[PDB]
Structures are given as C-alpha cells and as structure tokens.
Amino acid sequence: PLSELTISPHASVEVFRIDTPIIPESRKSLRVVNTGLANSVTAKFYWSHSFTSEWFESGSIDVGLGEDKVLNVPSNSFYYSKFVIYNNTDKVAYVTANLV
Numbered sequence: 001p002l003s004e005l006t007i008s009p010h011a012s013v014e015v016f017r018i019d020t021p022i023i024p025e026s027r028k029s030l031r032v033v034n035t036g037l038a039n040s041v042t043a044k045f046y047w048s049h050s051f052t053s054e055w056f057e058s059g060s061i062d063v064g065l066g067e068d069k070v071l072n073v074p075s076n077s078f079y080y081s082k083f084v085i086y087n088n089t090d091k092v093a094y095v096t097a098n099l100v
C-alpha cells in the first residue's frame with residue numbers, strides 16, 4: 001500500500017490503520033520519504049487493544065528533507081495498529097508513505 005501525503009504545518013496525519021481484532025498479527029513496517037519542504041517529519045507506530053480508550057506509542061523515527069527511511073515496527077502481534085506522521089514545522093511536508 002502506498003500514499004502520497006500532504007502534511008500541513010504544525011499538523012499530523014494518521015495513516016494505515018489496520019484492525020485484526022480476533023486473531024492478532026504482526027504488522028508491516030512503514031517506508032517514509034520526506035521530499036520537503038518541512039526540514040523533518042517524525043513517524044510513529046501506535047497500537048491498541050479492545051478494552052482501552054488509549055493508543056500506545058511504540059517506535060519513532062525522524063525523516064529529514066531528502067531522506068528515505070523505514071520506521072520499524074515491533075516483532076509482537078497486534079489487534080489494532082496505525083501510524084501517525086508529525087510535521088512539527090511551519091512548512092508543508094510532501095511525503096510518501098508505504099507499507100514494506
């Protein structure tokens with residue numbers, strides 16, 4: 001799966017939520033390419049389970065302008081997962097995101 005994403009200044013975008021609520025499964029990693037203009041974006045992996053209101057952070061990478069990096073994910077099986085990519089800058093981020 002691949003997505004061309006526009007991430008507005010001081011904003012985040014949630015991508016690739018995957019629900020496997022009965023039988024948990026390991027998850028694919030996320031390849032992130034930051035093409036600018038934002039000097040960096042931070043991609044994080046989140047997971048949850050059926051009896052909580054929270055998502056839990058487990059893993060993070062920073063991707064600078066011009067960088068092509070994979071955010072690794074845990075070896076664990078999960079019931080619910082998603083990624084959040086954060087643009088903590090005043091410039092728009094044009095990024096690509098795909099599962100690998």
Ligand code: NA
Nearest residue numbers: 009010011012
């Ligand atoms: Na906001």
Ligand code: NA
Nearest residue numbers: 050051052053
């Ligand atoms: Na809930």
Ligand code: NA
Nearest residue numbers: 058059072073
């Ligand atoms: Na991770």
